[PDB]
Structure 1
């Protein structure tokens, strides 16, 4: 039986009243107002609660007093003790020397005096204890001089705290705080070969309605200090967000391994914001900044990885309506590598779109952009670019096909400055003023055919979807414009139908091409799509060129059917799913990129995934910085096999693991092995992680990091009985994603 059903066998059930005064006693004496007394065994009820005793001894001047075996219970608590009192007007209650249990959730203990206060929002305990462990089990408890719990803000709060494991105290704090309810950090301890002993002791502060902080001392014994972690979460008229501010005043490991630096401080600032106001104003922040390049190699955190080459810093504000939008943004990047200081930023970028449908048979749109490009270096080019893109299209369609004809004008003005260092080092010069005006013409045509697939199974149907597109863009030389924004895009099957070879506006290639493809789909008798496959190709009638033609290739051929791509998905069952994708390029004489996965999931804790990723050595030459072709760690491409798996054992263990292997190196990329054992009041996790984490230039081989880790968390502080699989599966570099 599941861990929830095992723990809920110790949690007391409410079912005695029905949920939405009556009195019984062995004897009763005195008139009803003021000093009525009930002597010998008595039970008394009102709606959701009952009180029971050997004596009840009322007064009014409204107060209840009770003596001998005083026992009270309701839909949230049980209280027991030798003596008790309540005020029936203010709802205040006392029980002396008593024991308590929560109802419908874990939680029990003792106090010298147990109190209900503040319209019974608060419970307060003098000389109190708390544990989440079930009756007869005492594997941990927290003991205080005073304990408070708030039922609305779901927090327990404790003064002169001792933490006991079994009967023995292992910690003291003058003040401490615990989560107790549904409403993401929880008090936690770790040992690891990376940092030795660690703890994480979170404190939650409500600042105002729907904004709350989680100030969290994180200790690391290999290091000199507590790291202070500072998640702040909020809601606002502008939307919702999270801030984080990690800080170490100094760091002995950084002081030992990077000495002669100005200071030893380590910090990260992350700010995420997203939302919409009045449905028309859009606000986004996607900002990360760190003290030094090595922060994510040193510190396990949510907000980046050792896998990353830069920290991204976006701000944007936009207005959006049904027929128009305008957005002002800043894009900045902290690049971690010292190998090249150059990094361009948009400061600012303004994007504008206007839409007007039904202008005769035509739909029309205009895109405008203005951007200023700045560099981290004093000696790189800087530019203002203004772009204008008036667009008209004529969508014709029927039941079985469509044809869409589109015309654009691509109009761009550059004013470029700071050119002297580039023009004194390069044979083809940048120009101060450049105007680039290009017509674009596109025709996109699609059809759909259907067939009865009764060869496979009763009532299934096959769909065939051929697509052909013609695209034209005349040549302009652009070697006088520096490339600030234009990466070479990747040709997936849907990418075979782009009007763009590059992702920005600094390079627009000539186009004179037909792209042709076919998708086929199989539908079952429920009309659910069970399978698809897509295959397509680009045929070029003229060399697709910008004047900056600086790419190697392996063949000199620049015309004909050069690019091929395909994709497939099979929904074998609700539990089994298979994916695959391929790209081939006759300019490389090779498969350019490919990926595959097969996955089995029964449930959130039972799964197996096998996956493969490939990129050709020739694709690395064509699309990445020239030195990637020479460096041993880059030049070999990618040929990676991965396996990821999770399975439960005995309703309380989950075993999780991952293994990724480079088939060209014959060496591992990542391996991970998590084992979590879960009980009602604690869970223990072992986590092993071995990863590629650098390169040794003096010997030409990979550097590995090994983390062997052990972790303990408290449980039954919330309704959580899950075995930890989806967290373990995303602990590593190359984290799990669901491919069904």
Structure 2
């Protein structure tokens, strides 16, 4: 058995039965008793190995929920989850990444392995790939059950590659997708995209320069436009053909230096990189945005050919992105440290016709995106990471994060971490009610601490604590103890909702008993990530 207490659900206990009926597949059936509810939840986990790959199913079911029947009057609870991944022979890339719940609130209510109170939707995916060295083709379905929704149904992605066509290497990417909405009144599309690409890779010992050209060609057939076009001043068109050249140059050098002044026989490296990108302006305000979110610009992200993550927005470009990295290697040529800093200079506004974003500044030209990374492998037990993103259009640091970590062993570690995102960045990049609602508008300014240590030969103690520096309140805290042979005991407090008229957070508190440091460090929201 296993047992629990929580502020959400009072006393709980579990009576797991394990069922073995084949050498390659098995099941766990567990009647999950609860005290705040009147009924047993039945949870049913199934595991299999197959020629098609390895996968996991879960089916959780309440015949009736007394709390839901009182809290949603005048109206069962269940979760189904499936995950599969494989490559059959060496060519058939089969995958499933699917979950479905009866209602939005299931993850505020029930602790489970396969979703979180932290989630804004349940994802629902299937795909079949065929892949070989020169060619791949993938058929996929992308659906989302939103809790607070467009689907791709189906999507086809195809790639072909052909090297050595003279001095050039070449590829073509093509896609066909049908977009459907959960609402009967939203636009529909079928989109066809074609992207032939040619590049000339030149290199030697001290540097390289890659010159690349694409044609971006997209066809839209759009339907169900009447509800949108009767409400908006700029109209969607029933057919749209978008055709755009892209040109890119990506030059690099490497310099080195004797680091003997720091330590015996150490090596320093300096790597300036300077990329030019051009894409002409095409108005896309007559194309509805089904899949293109604005992208986050970390230091490696300074070198993209995309400002948005999909195909419905493709920003004009006439820009130089300029960076520099330097590295230190020790006498054994192991990398001890690196720092990278770079920026994007725009000679013309990065416009997309549907220029929907809100900025603190009215200028659009000159040096205005900056980013940097650093890493230091201080020793084989200590390591430090940092990142910063700055945007002159926000007049602020847009995002930052840092961590420092000590590990002696899988059981003996301490980590500190920090994450920041500005109020102006949340305003610019997220749904326009996030700029106003008190739980969202204040950015992020989160401090985290994590530790594990054996307190005696057989006894491990684990804990975590996350704090919001703007709220002056904890986001999560966790404590865990185990005795090995084995028994394990845990505690958690987490944010688990909000109270709307009172404008304060709801906290779930829980205590658990079971009959392991890494399993405990994984168990909370905000779970432990090894940063060495």
**TM-score, normalised with respect to structure 1:** 0.71
Range moving further from structure 2, 281-290 or 650-659: 650-659
The CA deviation string for residues 631-690 of structure 1, in whole angstroms up to 9 with x for no partner, is 1111110001011111111212222111111111111111112222335xxx44332211
Counterpart-to-counterpart distance in 1, 2:11 and 2:276: 64
SS across alignment from 2:297: coil
Q: Partners in 2 of 1:553 and 1:189 — Cα distance? A: 51
Deviations 1:170-198 (Å, cap 9, x if unpaired)?
xxxxxxxxxxxxxxxxx433444544443
**Partners of 2:408 and 2:283 in 1: how far apart?**
57
Instruction: Give the superposition deviation at 1:204.
Output: 2.6
Q: Alpha carbons of 1:559 and 1:620: their partners in 2 closer, same or farther (altered >3 Å)?
A: same
The offset of 1:216, in angstroms, is 2.0
Closer, same or farther: CA 657–702 of 1 in aligned 2, 3 Å: same
**Distance between the aligned counterparts of 1:485 and 1:575, measured in 2?**
43
Q: Secondary structure at the match of 2:493?
A: strand
Find the counterpart in structure 2 of residue 592 from structure 1: 398
Q: What SS does the aligned partner of 1:359 have?
A: coil
Deviation of the 1:363 alpha carbon:
0.5
CA 708–622 in structure 1, closer or farther in 2 if over 3 Å, else same: same
Work out the CA distance in 2 between the residues paired with 1:478 and 1:612: 38
Question: Is contact 1:535–1:566 with CA below 8 Å preserved after alignment?
Answer: yes
Alpha-carbon deviations, 1:31-53, whole Å to 9, x = none?
xxxxxxxxxxxxxxxxxxxxxxx
Q: Secondary structure at the match of 1:622?
A: helix
Measured after TM superposition, the shift of residue 237 of structure 1 is 1.5
Deviation at residue 700 of structure 1 after TM alignment: 1.4
Compared CA separation, residues 256 and 677, structure 1 to 2 (3 A) = farther
CA distance in 1 between counterparts of 2:522 and 2:23 reads 32
**What SS is found at the alignment partner of 1:358?**
coil
1:701 aligns with one of 501, 504, 509: 504
Query: Which whole-Å CA distance do the structure 2 matches of 1:303 and 1:328 have between them?
Result: 25
8 A Cα contact 1:641 1:661, kept in partner? yes
Distance in 1 separating the partners of 2:19 and 2:498: 44
1:133 paired residue number = none
SS in 2 for 1:627: coil
- TM-superposed deviation, 1:699: 1.5
Cα distance in 1, alignment partners of residues 184 and 174 from structure 2: 29
2:15 touches 2:32 (CA, 8 Å); kept in 1? yes
| Residues 158 and 173 in structure 2, CA contact (< 8 A), matched pair in contact too | yes
Aligned partners of 2:482 and 2:25: how far apart in 1? 33
Q: Secondary structure at the residue paired with 1:346?
A: strand
* CA shift digits 1:368-402 (9 cap, x unpaired): 00000000000000000000000000000011111
Is residue 422–residue 443 contact of structure 2 (8 Å, CA) maintained in 1? yes
Name the residue aligned to 1:232.
46
Q: CA–CA distance in 2 between the matches of 1:422 and 1:406? A: 38
Query: In structure 1, what is the Cα distance between the partners aligned to 2:301 and 2:4?
Result: 46
Q: Taking structure 1 as reference, are residues 704 and 195 closer, same or farther at Cα in structure 2, changes over 3 Å only?
A: closer
Comparing 427-436 and 658-667, the one that deviates more: 658-667
Q: In structure 1, what is the equivalent of residue 421 of structure 2?
A: 615
State the Cα distance separating 1:480 from its structure 2 match.
0.1
The separation in 2 between residues aligned to 1:649 and 1:643, in whole angstroms, is 18
Runs of 4+ in 1 over 6 A off after TM superposition: none
Residue 733 of structure 1 aligns with which residue? 525
Q: Distance in 2 between matches of 1:482 and 1:415?
A: 11
2:70 aligned counterpart, secondary structure: helix
Deviations 1:240-286 (A, max 9, x none): 111111111112222232222xxx81111110000011101110000
Partner SS, residue 629 of structure 1: coil
**Is 1:192–1:710's contact at 8 Å kept on the other side of the alignment?**
no
1:695 CA drift (Å): 1.6
Could you tell me whether the CA contact under 8 Å between 1:537 and 1:561 is conserved in 2? yes
Secondary structure class of the residue paired with 1:550: coil
> 412-421 or 685-694: which moved more?
685-694
Task: State the secondary structure of the residue aligned to 1:704.
Answer: strand
Counterpart contact for 2:108–2:497, Cα < 8 Å: no
- TM-superposition CA deviations, 1:72-115 (whole Å, max 9, x none): xxxxxxxxxxxxxxxxxxxxxxxxxxxxxxxxxxxxxxxxxxxx
The CA deviation at 1:206 is: 2.9
TM-superposition CA deviations, 1:572-612 (whole Å, max 9, x none): 11111100000000000000000000011111111111100
After superposing the two structures, state which structure 1 stretch, 455-464 or 503-512, moved more: 455-464
The answer as to 2:252 corresponding to 1:454 is: no
Asked if 1 retains the 8 angstrom alpha-carbon contact of 2:4 and 2:511, the reply is: no
Cα contact 2:19–2:28 (8 A) shared by 1:
yes
Structure 1 partner of 2:140? 329
Displacement of 1:711 in angstroms is 4.0
1:343-364 deviation line (CA, Å, top 9, x unaligned)? 1000110000000001011100
CA distance in 2, matches of 1:374, 1:191: 43
Q: C-alpha separation between the residues in 2 aligned to 1:220 and 1:647? A: 33
- Residues 209/677 of structure 1: CA separation in 2 closer, same or farther (3 Å cut): closer
CA distance in 2, matches of 1:637, 1:188: 39
How far off is 1:209 after superposition?
3.5
Provide Cα deviations, 1:431-482, integer angstroms capped at 9, x if missing partner: 0010100000000011111111111111110011111000000000000000
Q: CA deviation at 1:238?
A: 1.1
User: Aligned equivalents of 1:521 and 1:606: distance in 2?
Assistant: 29
Per chain length, whose mean CA-contact separation is higher, i.e. which structure has more relative contact order (CA < 8 Å, sep 6+)? 2
**Residues 498-647 of structure 1 aligned to structure 2 (within 5 Å):** 498-647=304-453
1:731 is displaced (CA, Å) by 1.6
8 Å Cα contact 1:217-1:227 kept in structure 2: yes
Aligned with 2:144: secondary structure?
strand
Normalised by the length of structure 2, the TM-score is 0.98
Aligned-partner Cα distance in 1 for 2:133–2:452: 46
Write the distance in 1 (CA, Å) between the matches of 2:268 and 2:70: 66
Aligned-residue CA RMSD in angstroms?
A: 1.4
Q: Distance in 1 between matches of 2:504 and 2:106?
A: 23
- Give 1:730 shift: 1.6
Is the CA contact 1:442–1:469 (under 8 Å) kept in the aligned structure 2? Answer: yes
Report the alpha carbon displacement of residue 311 of structure 1 after superposing the two structures with TM: 0.3
Q: Is the 8 A contact 2:91 2:130 kept in 1?
A: yes
Distance 1:349 1:511 in 2: 28
Please identify the structure whose Cα radius of gyration is greater. 1
Change (3 A) 1:684 1:195: farther
TM-superposition CA deviations, 1:478-509 (whole Å, max 9, x none): 00000000000000000000000000000000
Q: For residues 241 and 400 of structure 2, what CA distance do their matches in structure 1 show?
A: 39
The answer to whether the 8 Å contact 2:6/2:508 transfers is no
For residues 695 and 219 of structure 1, what CA distance do their matches in structure 2 show? 27
Q: Structure 1: which 5+ runs fail to align?
A: 1-186, 337-341, 713-723
**Distance 1:676-1:208 versus aligned 2 partners, 3 A rule:** closer
How far, CA to CA, are the matches of 1:206 and 1:650 in structure 2?
Answer: 37
Q: Distance in 2 between matches of 1:509 and 1:652?
A: 59
Q: Do 2:373 and 2:387's aligned partners in 1 also have CA atoms closer than 8 Å? A: yes
Shift of 1:419: 0.3
Distance 1:528 1:366 in 2: 38
Conserved in 1, the CA contact under 8 Å of 2:5 and 2:512? yes
- Which range moved further: 434-443 or 601-610? 601-610
